[PDB]
Amino acid sequence: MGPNPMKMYPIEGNKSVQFIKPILEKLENVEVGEYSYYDSKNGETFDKQILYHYPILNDKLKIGKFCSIGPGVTIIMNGANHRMDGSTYPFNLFGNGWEKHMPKLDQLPIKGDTIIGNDVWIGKDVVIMPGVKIGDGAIVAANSVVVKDIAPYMLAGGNPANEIKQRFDQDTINQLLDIKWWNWPIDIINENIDKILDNSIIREV
Amino acid sequence: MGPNPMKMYPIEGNKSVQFIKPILEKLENVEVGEYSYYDSKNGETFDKQILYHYPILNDKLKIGKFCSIGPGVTIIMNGANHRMDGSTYPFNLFGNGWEKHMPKLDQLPIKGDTIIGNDVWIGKDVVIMPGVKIGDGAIVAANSVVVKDIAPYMLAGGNPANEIKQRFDQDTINQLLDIKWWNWPIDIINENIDKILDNSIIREVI
Amino acid sequence: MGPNPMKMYPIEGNKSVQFIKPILEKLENVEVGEYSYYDSKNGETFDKQILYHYPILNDKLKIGKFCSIGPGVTIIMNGANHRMDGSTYPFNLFGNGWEKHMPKLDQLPIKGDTIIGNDVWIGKDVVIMPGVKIGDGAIVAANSVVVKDIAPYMLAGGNPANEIKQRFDQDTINQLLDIKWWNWPIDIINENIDKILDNSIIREVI
Ligand SMILES: CC(C)(COP(=O)(O)OP(=O)(O)OC[C@H]1O[C@@H](n2cnc3c(N)ncnc32)[C@H](O)[C@@H]1OP(=O)(O)O)[C@@H](O)C(=O)NCCC(=O)NCCS
Ligand SMILES: CC(C)(COP(=O)(O)OP(=O)(O)OC[C@H]1O[C@@H](n2cnc3c(N)ncnc32)[C@H](O)[C@@H]1OP(=O)(O)O)[C@@H](O)C(=O)NCCC(=O)NCCS
Ligand SMILES: CC(C)(COP(=O)(O)OP(=O)(O)OC[C@H]1O[C@@H](n2cnc3c(N)ncnc32)[C@H](O)[C@@H]1OP(=O)(O)O)[C@@H](O)C(=O)NCCC(=O)NCCS
Ligand SMILES: CC1=C\[C@@H](O)CC(=O)Cc2nc(co2)C(=O)N2CCC=C2C(=O)O[C@H](C(C)C)[C@H](C)/C=C/C(=O)NC\C=C\1
Ligand SMILES: CC1=C\[C@@H](O)CC(=O)Cc2nc(co2)C(=O)N2CCC=C2C(=O)O[C@H](C(C)C)[C@H](C)/C=C/C(=O)NC\C=C\1
DSSP, rough: OOTTTTTSSSSSTOSSSSESSHTTTTTTEEEEEEEEEEEEESOOGGGEEEEEGGGGGGEEEESSSSSHHHHHHHHOGGOOOOSSSSOOOGGGGSSTTTGGGOOOOSSSSOOEEEESSSEEEEOTOEOOOOEEEETTEEOSSOEEEOOSSBTTTEEEETEEEEEEEEEEEEHHHHHHHHHHHGGGOHHHHHTTTHHHHHTTHHHOO | OOTTTOOOOOOOSSSSSSEEEHHTTTTTTEEEEETOOOOOOOOOOOGGGGSOOOOOGOOEEEEEOOOEEEEOOOOOOOOOOOSSSSSOOGGGGGGOOOOGGGGOOOGSOOOOEEEEESSOOOOTTTTEOOOOOOOOTTTTTTTEEOOOOOOEEEEEEEEEEEEEEESSSSHHHHHHHHHHHGGGGGGHHSSSHHHHHTTTTHHOOO | OOOOTOSSSSSSSSEEEEEEHHHHSSTTTEEOOOOOOOEEEESSOGGGGSSSSOOGOOEEEOOOOOOOOTOOOOOOOOOOOOOSSSSSOGGGGGGGGGGGOOOOOGOOOOOEEEESSOOOEETTTTTTTTEEEEEETTTEEETOOEOOOOOOOEEEEEETTTEESSSSSSHHHHHHHHHHHSSSSEEEETTHHHHHHHHTTHHOOO
C-alpha cells in the first residue's frame, strides 16, 4: 500500500510532485531516501536545484527519507568557493597564460558533505550552503539560508537560519530519535501512519 | 481630483503600476483599500502574488488605504502549512491507500488573518508570512521576511524582519494614529496633500 | 599575458562571464575598475542588474578592480527612495492634479554613493542597498542584503549582512592596504600572481 517509490511522478498526470530518488540515482555520489519528494516550482526536476556539484571535488549530498522539500529550494555544493588565503580573484580562469595559476585541490576550501536527515520539512526558496547538517524531523522556515547545522526536531528560520524552538520536549524527541519509524519495513509503517502523524507511536513501539 | 481608484491601470500608457482594489475585488476573503497600488515586476497582476489562499481555511487578507507595494512582494497565506503535531510528511497526498489519512480541518495549524494597515510601504521582494499584522505608517525594507507583527510607523527589515527604529516620536505617532487622515473624504485629503506629505497636518487638526 | 580587460567576453565560447568596465563604461555616473567581472545568471549583461539609477539624483556607483561578482547580484540606487518626512504615498506619481506635489530634489532621501572596493568577492544573489561602502578585499556571502558599510578584508553575510570575521591578522591587512597591488601595471602584477594568491607579496614588496 502506498505509491511506488521508483516513479519520478507518483501521482498519475501530475508532473509537479516528484520523488527525488529515481531522479537522482543516476548521479554520482548523491544519496536519497525513498519517499522524499520535491514540490516543483515551474515544472523543473530537482537535479536543476543542486548547484556547483563537481565529481573531482568529491563532496557528497545526503537526503534521508520522508522528506518534503518545498519549491525553489537550492542546495549549493563546494564548487563555488574560491581560494582565500590570498586574493579571491580567479586568475586561472581567464587563461592566456594564467592557467599556470590553477589551484591545487588541497588549496580550495571545502567545507564538507551536506546531509539532510529523515522526516525533514524544508520550506520554499530555502538556500542550503555547503557542508551543512540537518537533523531528523527538523523544520526549516520558507526563505531561510542555512549556513550551519540544525539539531533534530528543531524549527529554524532566517538568513542566517537559527534554531527558534524545540518541536517537542526532549523526552519525546529522545524516544523519537530512538524509534526511527522511517527505518521500519513499509508494511509496518502502513499500519501506523496514524500514530506517526500524531506522535502516539512512542507509546506503542 | 487625482486618479480613478477603480481603474486597473491609473497611469496612462503604463501597464506596470496598478490599483489593487479593482483586481482583488472579485476575490473572497479579501479586502483592499482605496488608493493602494502595486508596481508590477514582470507585468504580473497582484493576484498572482498571493499564494496558498483556499477559502476552505477561511483566513482573510486585509490591505488598507494608500499603500505602496514594491514589485515581487509575496503574500503567503495558510494553505501551505503542514500538520505538525507529528510527522510533517503529507501521506494523504500520494493516494494508493494513503488517501484515507487526509488531515482534519482543525488539525491544520492556522495562524490567523493577514492584516496590512494604511499608508504602509513595502519594499521590493518582501515575503509576508501567515497571520502577520503591519500597523499603519510602517516601512518594511526591501527583501525582508515578515514573521511577526510590526508596530505603527516603525521601520522594519531583515530576515526575520525586526523593528529597527520608530519613524517619529511617540507623541506624533500617537497623534497621527488618532487623526487617521486616510479615512477622510477625498476633497479634504486633496486639499491637505502637502501637510500629509510633511506631517504638519498634525498642528492643523489639533 | 592574460585577457585584455577591454574585451566584453574575456573567456572564449563563453557568453556568461563578462568584464564589467567595457559594458558599464557607457553609463552615466558609473565608475568600473579593470579586471572585475560578472558571472551571468541567465545571459543578462550586468547593466540590467543596476536598478533605479536616475542621473537627476546624481548619486554615483564606483567599483574597484579585480572584483569577482557572482550571478544575480543586484545593486539598488537612490531612485527608489520614497519621501518620508511624512506620508510615503507617491501622490505626484498619479497626476490628474496631484502632480503639484512632485517632491523637491532636496526633499528625497539620498543616502550617498555606493562604493565597492578592489579584490572584493560578492556572492550570488546578493542585494546591495543604496549608499553602502564595501572594503578592499572583503567577502560578502551569497544571498546577503547589504544595508550598512563593510570593512576591508572583512567577511560578512546575512540579511542584514553583518561583519562575521576578519580574513587575516590586523598586521597583514594593514600592509595589503598599503601595497595596493591592484594598482600596479599588469606587467608587474603578472609576475606575482602567485605571491598575491597566497599573501606572500607582503614579504617581497615591503
Ligand atoms: C516555520 C513555520 C512552519 C511556522 O512555525 P510554527 O510552528 O507555526 O511557529 P510560529 O509561527 O508561531 O513561530 C514562532 C516564533 O518563530 C518565529 N519565526 C517564524 N518563522 C521564522 C523565520 N523564518 N525566522 C525566524 N523566526 C521565525 C516567529 O516570529 C515567532 O517569534 P516568537 O516566538 O519570539 O514570538 C512557517 O513560518 C513556515 O515557514 N512554513 C513553510 C511554508 C513553505 O515554504 N511551504 C512549502 C512546502 S509545502
Ligand atoms: C528601509 C529604507 C527606506 C531605509 O530607511 P532609512 O530611514 O533611510 O534608514 P537608514 O538608512 O538610516 O538605516 C537605519 C538603520 O536601519 C538599518 N537597516 C536599513 N535597512 C535594513 C534592513 N533591511 N534590515 C535591517 N536593518 C536595516 C541600517 O543598518 C541602520 O542601522 P543603524 O540604526 O545602527 O544606523 C530602505 O533601505 C528601503 O528598504 N527602501 C525600499 C526600496 C524599494 O524596494 N522600493 C520599491 C517600492 S517604491
Ligand atoms: C561566506 C563563505 C565564504 C563562508 O565563510 P568561511 O570563510 O568559509 O567561514 P565559515 O563558514 O567556516 O565560518 C564563519 C562563520 O560565519 C558563519 N557564516 C557563513 N555564512 C554566513 C552568512 N551568510 N551569514 C552569517 N554567518 C555566516 C558560519 O556559520 C560561521 O559561524 P561561527 O563563527 O560560529 O563558526 C561562503 O558561505 C560563501 O558565501 N561563498 C560564496 C559562494 C557563491 O555564491 N559563489 C558564487 C561566486 S562564482
Ligand atoms: C566559481 C569560479 C568562477 C566563476 O565565477 C566563473 C564561472 O562561473 C564560469 C566558469 N568557471 C569555469 C567554467 O566556466 C571553470 O572551469 N571552473 C568553475 C569551477 C571550477 C572551475 C575550474 O577551472 O575548476 C578547476 C578544475 C576544472 C580542475 C579547478 C578544480 C579550479 C577551480 C577554481 O579555481 N575554482 C574557483 C571558482 C571559480
Ligand atoms: C520608486 C518610487 C515609486 C515607484 O513605486 C513607481 C514606479 O516604479 C513607476 C514609475 N515611476 C515613475 C514613472 O513610473 C517616475 O516618474 N518615477 C520613478 C522614479 C522617480 C520618479 C518620478 O516621479 O520622477 C520625478 C522626476 C521625473 C523629476 C521626481 C524626481 C520624483 C520622483 C519621486 O517621488 N521619486 C521617489 C520614488 C518612488
